[PDB]
Paper text:
This trimer is the primary target for neutralizing antibodies making it a key candidate for vaccine development. The region encoding for the transmembrane helix and cytosolic tail were replaced by a 27 amino acid C-terminal T4 bacteriophage fibritin foldon domain to ensure protein trimerization.
The cryo-EM structures were determined for both ancestral and Beta spike trimers after incubation at 37 °C. Single particle ab-initio 3D-classification identified one main canonical 3D-class or map for the trimeric protein that corresponds to a single canonical conformation. As opposed to the ancestral trimer, most Beta trimeric particles are classified into a single model with two RBDs in the up conformation (here referred as two_RBD up conformation). Moreover, this fusion prone tendency observed for Beta is more pronounced in our structure, where only the two_RBD up conformation is present. The two_RBD up conformation of the Beta trimer stochastically presents the three RBD amino acid substitutions, K417N, E484A, and N501Y present in most of the VOC including Omicron, resulting in the potential for higher elicited cross-neutralizing antibody titers.
Author numbering:
A (entry chain C): 297 to 441, 448 to 457, 491 to 496, 508 to 620, 641 to 676, 690 to 742
B (entry chain A): 27 to 65, 81 to 130, 167 to 172, 187 to 241, 263 to 331, 529 to 623, 629 to 676, 689 to 811, ...
C (entry chain C): 942 to 1139
D (entry chain B): 942 to 990
Write the structure that this text describes.
């Protein structure tokens, strides 16, 4: 019926039809995080006695600690909380490299000026954000808590009479050091599982590897720039990564006119991961192997054919022809004494149907 | 004072493990063969510093880095000693031989690399290669401009360079190539290999840069500069080109001038009545002409379509050799540097263009010459002289034809998105492009099997040669299968030995295995040897091989007695030709380049398709998992859409080129099937179809994705001059030869066949009478014996 | 009906391509709707162009794919038509010596017929049927002279020798009108004693 | 002046293809202008991308 749906017909002529793809689904989810519990000093940044001016913003480096952004984004005191290139919901799941904390005080009209690609005196002279800015800015009302908050106007401090926190990350390749409240999970091997390792997720098979990783190396990569290995965050062991089995599925059918039995071939898939026959083209299920050789009926691959014959589907190695030994010798010749007149039909296409498409009217 | 750095100052660019891969990386490196100062004094830092020290007694202790180094600035200070490595800044950290170090400041962090290797007793930096492994990294974010060392130590300066690193079997880099060192190294970087085969490779693009900026406005003004590539601004006309005075006659109201393709090629000065001809600045390709790296490291550089005067203007001292040198040659293809002009015409070795070819010849160097079309010859033509061969040579020629490709099926959905429900749902909105691509690939895959079957499966029975190999003295053992050893012949084994699944990519096995193809080839050979061409028309009719060869000489126009009298010589010539074919196949591997070209093309296209999955395509990242885990669904549908668009375009391009290549391979397979039908299953009378000469017969052999035809032909060898006449007069009646020509040495007239001197006495059996002697031009007097 | 598959295959491919091109019109291609009328009715002109551009890009891509596939298919059909014209010239207008160019066996003639978007050739050929074994010699040795057959081969029905044409057993008495002399009997390998009637 | 048509057809086809490829540079493709310099010096860096 899947073949019928693919062909959009209630009857299928004999042959082999590719219907869909077979993929091994992951078994369980693995989260492997370093056993580090010290909390990041977010209180020292969000509860400081005072903040510096816009032209003298202070930076605090956050590393080697577990960060809890849930407390940050669950507080209604923050008037403005918008994040670019990252999601506050997924902040806890994500594990970063080096979290930065920039603190300065600006007026309400300049709050929107703290954004990538925004022009103005404040952005062009005091604090500019990169065009590829990862991280975000947090602001809240501070009029309750006074001329020590200056603003530079020329590039020249023209002081006059909102507390702002900026966070920055870089999730490209560097080893992760600031993880969230995610918990570690035991490690399993030799089974297609969903794995998480310090932030990058994937699905595959983790096995023991003999790769000679250098002490500073964190993971491996193949020729095609694919993550082939990894280092356990909690143990110095090195785990390979192999994709779960996948392939195409083909249906060998004798024709719904003749019969309804079918054979299923999983192309390139070993018979273990799937009246079961293993061929060089894949695993053949539903066809019985026959040691006899016949003319090819339905090709499968690597010299294997399928046929509906005594009545069941059989798979065999094709016979190339009928054997013949010419009675060759140095003084014998074979000469015909008769003949036959043969008429043979040959068909050749000569032309197609001429079509013209009006691009404007079609589009 | 100064010394050569050789190949020192290279480190691991990152923590990613790699193995058995050549990786190209752009990073701050120490250029190869640079000048490193040999030495307490304060030194600049620039973008980076390389360090070395052959301290036998380890006199050198530590380092200082900073800007002013005393107050008002923060300074880094390392007092690495024999007990504890101490680093201070705010920040505190506690942790004959040749010691190397690298210091750099890529915005944040202060990276340190090191290496400790033994050396012999030498003064300068040793040769060989070594790798620098990072030791510590300091996230300080400090500005450093000068530094000091707290007794012979070398100091080098890093530069932003592109390198090609060769990772060994286990994570270690064995060799490196500096791309900007010289044209050979740039060719190596372009080809992504450490060896370069002989040829000419278009490596770079040469462009002349503007010298200044011109702003012109009617009565911000600048003087008008002509006759040089200058950036101009004529009342808002932004462009770059060479300004020259024009003979054009602009109408007073016209301010611009455009050509057919709507490009501004003339301009009017706002402040004057001057009309200036805008000419684009010089540009073109830069190709490197090299012999094999196995032979020499010398190269020549061809700048395509430029004069030899602009190539100095718009690098390492190694490249400056290839800009001047008095060797400078001008050709219609462009400017050659590094090749001598000899004006002696030789056969083409490496083409350049306009009849110019380059070669590596003897002190050996690269010479540029005008290619020779061939050796001159003047045929001694006269109205009564004929050249007739008195001997012959049996020639065996090899013809190679591709028949099929590798059957690759690309999983469309898994390639584009891959284990992603959101991405698959988004891709569902694009219609049936995906099914179209799958159907096209499946059609190509089926066509490959059809091609192979139509070329090889042409025999109705599987013929077996008799165990007694009494083939008139001919020796087919090198082409017949060997049961005692595949079951492939010697030549087939030579051919197969010579010629040599993730991301939704699958390779389908061919329907016919190599053993089956060899069985077809063996059946064809046995049928041809034991029956001739009778097995291609009906049932195989046995005939002795000597009589079959007599048949084939009769077919090419030579009588049977020639074979029956030179049977041993012809057999020896055929055996020697087969042995020469075997020796050539064993020695050289350039003959099989037609199948290797197809294999390389398919592999390169598939590799490009794979590598296109790493492209950003304007998104946050090229990883759908990263995009999904980083962004919320309402805002993650833009990056995923960009990735879908890019991957779909790449897949469509791959499928289109695959279709075109499949058409080419189908044409090749049709030609191969036609040659099998006509050259192998019969004797062809079409000239130069089954080899050069008079086609006697042919033999098929199987090769990976192709067939090889051994074309046995007949070639006349030793001509001799004779006097000839169109007809002879005997009794007032003209006589013409029944089959052949009339010849005379110097006294007597005979009649002989055309392709082999065999004179018979002129007879009424050899000649026929027609007409009178007063009409034929050139008739001669002689006698005909009855 | 599977003998005429080639023309039916061409018709099916063309119809499938046209049908897929038509069905590609009812696709969003990222836009909110796949119909310009509803897009324009729902959205204002400043922001309707955003969806109109997506529809334009998708439809242009589909049209370009269709045209390129048609070009490749037309190149294939041109090659087939050139082959058909060559067969027309070489097999109907003449008798061809090329092996297997027009049928299996020795070509005698061919007849053309017209089929929808194609041509059909009826190839009349000659096929030898019932072979027999004979003893043969490269040449026959008369009194000091080696005789070779002018046209055919020597055969023996056990006791006597005749000369016959290659493709049909028509034995004839060996005579000087059937054979020609060239050299003596020593050089030829496999020569056989016999007599030649003069 | 019509016997040598095939070669003239090839030359004309190649020249027309090159001319169309060059002419496409003046096309707008939905942007505000076909001049890259105008696009650069008419909008801010992020919106000009
Ligand atoms: C040569 O072949 C033809 C055709 O195969 C033979 O003719 C047949 O002979 C049988 C027996 O006499 C008849 O029953 C058939 O009716 C004949 N067929 C036709 C089409 O005439 C013929 O006998 C064979 N032998 C010779 C010597 O001609
Ligand atoms: C984390 O786990 C590893 C392996 O079990 C262990 O060696 C290490 O001591 C643990 N970390 C701490 C802080 O105990
Ligand atoms: C398939 O799996 C079996 C069992 O692990 C193994 O013996 C075999 O080598 C694998 N491959 C094939 C092609 O059978
Ligand atoms: C087929 O051959 C295999 C290999 O010799 C043998 O094990 C098997 O029993 C045979 N089966 C039949 C039905 O002959
Ligand atoms: C690792 O690579 C080196 C080459 O540097 C090689 O000699 C060695 O055999 C490889 N394997 C091991 C286990 O060292
Ligand atoms: C080199 O310059 C001359 C004039 O100085 C010019 O005629 C010639 O075309 C130029 N060479 C090339 C390859 O354009
Ligand atoms: C070729 O170059 C040589 C330079 O040594 C010169 O003597 C000779 O005349 C040149 N030949 C021609 C035909 O110009
Ligand atoms: C013909 O050439 C062969 C060798 O190629 C040798 O017998 C001799 O040179 C020639 N034979 C005669 C009879 O002239
Ligand atoms: C045929 O050639 C092979 C190798 O060239 C040789 O071993 C063999 O003896 C030859 N055949 C005869 C009958 O001498
Ligand atoms: C025939 O004569 C011409 C001119 O006399 C001469 O060049 C040629 O070598 C002669 N041929 C032979 C085979 O000697
Ligand atoms: C020419 O050939 C004939 C052959 O019978 C011979 O008698 C005669 O001497 C030859 N003459 C010359 C000049 O070679
Ligand atoms: C060949 O040409 C020469 C040149 O005039 C002429 O004298 C001679 O008669 C011609 N011979 C024949 C046989 O035509
Ligand atoms: C040939 O002989 C005839 C009769 O003897 C004579 O008329 C004629 O002139 C001769 N031809 C030549 C070219 O001498
Ligand atoms: C000819 O002789 C061979 C071997 O003796 C035999 O197999 C065959 O049947 C005979 N007849 C024909 C027509 O080949
Ligand atoms: C061979 O043929 C001849 C002539 O047809 C005949 O006289 C003779 O008897 C035949 N011999 C045999 C053995 O058939
Ligand atoms: C044919 O070969 C055999 C060897 O089996 C040999 O005895 C016989 O003499 C050969 N035929 C001739 C006519 O020499
Ligand atoms: C052929 O006949 C000749 C002469 O009569 C004789 O010498 C020779 O031996 C004969 N050969 C055979 C094989 O009978």
């Amino acid at each position: 019926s899947e073949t019928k749906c693919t062909l959009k017909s209630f009857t299928v002529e004999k042959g082999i039809y590719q219907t869909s793809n077979f993929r091994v689904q992951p078994t369980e989810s693995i989260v492997r995080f370093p056993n580090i519990t010290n909390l990041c000093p977010f209180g020292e940044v969000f509860n400081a006695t005072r903040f510096a001016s816009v032209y003298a913003w202070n930076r605090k480096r956050i590393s080697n600690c577990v960060a809890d952004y849930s407390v940050l984004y669950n507080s209604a005191s923050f008037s403005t909380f918008k994040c670019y290139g990252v999601s506050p919901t997924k902040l806890n799941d994500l594990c970063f490299t080096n979290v930065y904390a920039d603190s300065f005080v600006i007026r309400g009209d300049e709050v929107r000026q703290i954004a990538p690609g925004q022009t103005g005196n404040i952005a062009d002279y005091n604090y500019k954000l990169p065009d590829d800015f990862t991280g975000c800015v947090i602001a809240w009302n501070s009029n309750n808590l006074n001329y020590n908050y200056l603003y530079r106007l020329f590039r020249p401090l023209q002081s006059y009479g909102y507390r702002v926190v900026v966070l920055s990350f870089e999730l490209l390749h560097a080893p992760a050091t600031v993880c969230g409240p995610k918990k570690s999970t035991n490690l399993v091997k030799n089974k297609c599982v969903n794995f998480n390792f310090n932030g990058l997720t994937g699905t595959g098979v983790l096995t023991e590897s003999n790769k000679k990783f250098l002490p500073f190396q964190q993971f491996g990569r193949d020729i095609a720039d694919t993550t082939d290995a990894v280092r356990d965050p909690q143990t110095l062991e090195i785990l390979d990564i192999t994709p779960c089995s996948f392939g195409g599925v083909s249906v060998i059918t004798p024709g719904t006119n003749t019969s309804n039995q079918v054979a299923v071939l999983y192309q390139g898939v070993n018979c273990t991961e799937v009246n079961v026959f293993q061929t060089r083209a894949g695993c053949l299920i539903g066809a019985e192997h026959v040691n006899n050789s016949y003319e090819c009926d339905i090709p499968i691959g690597a010299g294997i054919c399928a046929s509906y014959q005594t009545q069941s589907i059989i798979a065999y190695t094709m016979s190339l022809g009928v054997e013949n030994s010419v009675a060759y010798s140095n003084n014998s010749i074979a000469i015909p004494t008769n003949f036959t007149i043969s008429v043979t039909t040959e068909i050749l296409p000569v032309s197609m149907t001429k079509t013209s498409v009006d691009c404007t009217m079609y589009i | 004072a100064y010394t050569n750095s050789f190949t020192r100052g290279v480190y691991y660019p990152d923590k990613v493990f790699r193995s058995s891969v050549l990786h190209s990386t752009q990073d701050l490196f120490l250029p190869f063969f640079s000048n490193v100062t040999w030495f307490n004094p304060v030194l600049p830092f620039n973008d980076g510093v390389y360090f070395a020290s052959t301290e036998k007694s380890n006199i050198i202790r530590g380092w200082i880095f900073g800007t002013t180094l005393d107050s008002k600035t923060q300074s880094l200070l390392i007092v690495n000693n024999a007990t504890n490595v101490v680093i201070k800044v705010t920040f505190e950290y506690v942790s004959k031989n040749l010691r190397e170090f690298v210091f750099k400041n890529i915005d944040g962090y202060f990276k340190i690399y090191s290496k400790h290797t033994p050396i012999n007793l030498v003064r300068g930096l040793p040769q060989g290669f070594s790798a620098l492994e990072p030791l510590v990294d300091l996230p300080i974010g400090i500005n450093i401009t000068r530094f000091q060392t707290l007794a012979a130590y070398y100091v080098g300066y890093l530069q932003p360079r592109t390198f090609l690193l060769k990772y060994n079997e286990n994570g270690t880099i064995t060799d490196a190539v500096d791309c900007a060192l010289d044209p050979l190294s740039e060719t190596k970087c372009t080809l992504k290999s450490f060896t370069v085969e002989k040829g000419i490779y278009q490596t770079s693009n040469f462009r002349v840069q503007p010298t200044e900026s011109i702003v012109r406005f009617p009565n911000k003004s600048t003087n008008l500069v002509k006759n040089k590539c200058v950036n101009f601004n004529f009342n808002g006309l932004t462009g770059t080109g060479v300004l020259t005075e024009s003979n054009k006659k602009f109408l007073p109201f016209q301010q611009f001038g455009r050509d057919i393709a709507d490009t501004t090629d003339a301009v009017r000065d706002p402040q004057t009545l001057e009309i200036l001809d805008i000419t684009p600045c010089s540009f073109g390709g830069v190709s490197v002409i090299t012999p094999g790296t196995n032979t020499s490291n010398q190269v020549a550089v061809l700048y395509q379509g430029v004069n030899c005067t602009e190539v100095p203007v718009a690098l390492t001292p190694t490249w400056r050799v290839y800009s001047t040198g008095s060797n400078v040659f001008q050709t219609r293809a462009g400017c050659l540097i590094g090749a001598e002009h000899v004006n002696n015409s030789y056969e083409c070795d490496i083409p350049i263009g306009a009849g110019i070819c380059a070669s590596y010849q003897t002190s050996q160097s690269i010479i540029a010459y005008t290619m020779s079309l061939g050796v001159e010859n003047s045929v001694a033509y006269s109205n009564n002289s004929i050249a007739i061969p008195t001997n012959f040579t049996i020639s065996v020629t090899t013809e190679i034809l591709p028949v099929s490709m590798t059957k690759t099926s690309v999983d469309c959905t898994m390639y584009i998105c891959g284990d992603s429900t959101e991405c698959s749902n988004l891709l569902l909105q694009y219609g049936s492009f995906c099914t179209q691509l799958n159907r096209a690939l499946t059609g190509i895959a089926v066509e490959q099997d059809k091609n192979t079957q139509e070329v090889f499966a042409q025999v109705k029975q599987i013929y077996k040669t008799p165990p007694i190999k009494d083939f008139g003295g001919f020796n087919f053992s090198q082409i017949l299968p060997d049961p005692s050893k595949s079951k492939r012949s010697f030549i087939e084994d030579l051919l197969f030995n010579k010629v040599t699944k993730f991301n939704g990519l699958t390779v389908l096995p061919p329907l016919l295995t190599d053993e089956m193809i060899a069985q077809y080839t063996s059946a064809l050979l046995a049928g041809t040897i034991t029956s001739g061409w009778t097995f291609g028309a009906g049932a195989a009719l046995q005939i002795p091989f000597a009589m079959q060869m007599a048949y084939r000489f009769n077919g090419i126009g030579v009588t049977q007695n020639v074979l029956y009298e030179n049977q041993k010589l012809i057999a020896n010539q055929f055996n020697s030709a087969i042995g020469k074919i075997q020796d050539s196949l064993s020695s050289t591997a350039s003959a099989l380049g037609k199948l290797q070209d197809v294999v390389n093309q398919n592999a390169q296209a598939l590799n490009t398709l794979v590598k296109q999955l790493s492209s950003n395509f304007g998104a946050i990242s090229s990883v759908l998992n990263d995009i999904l885990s980083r962004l919320d669904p309402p805002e993650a549908e833009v990056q995923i859409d960009r990735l879908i668009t890019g991957r779909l375009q790449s897949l469509q391009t791959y499928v289109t080129q695959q279709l075109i290549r499949a058409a080419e391979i189908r044409a090749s397979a049709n030609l191969a099937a036609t040659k099998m039908s006509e050259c192998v299953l019969g004797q062809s009378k079409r000239v130069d179809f089954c080899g050069k000469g008079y086609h006697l017969m042919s033999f098929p052999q199987s090769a990976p994705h192709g067939v090889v035809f051994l074309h046995v032909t007949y070639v006349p060898a030793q001509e001799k001059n004779f006097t000839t006449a169109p007809a002879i007069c005997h009794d007032g009646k003209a006589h013409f030869p029944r089959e052949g020509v009339f010849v005379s040495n110097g006294t007597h007239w005979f009649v002989t066949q055309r392709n082999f001197y065999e004179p018979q006495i002129i007879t009424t059996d050899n000649t026929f009478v027609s007409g009178n002697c007063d009409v034929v031009i050139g008739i001669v007097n002689n006698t005909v014996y009855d």
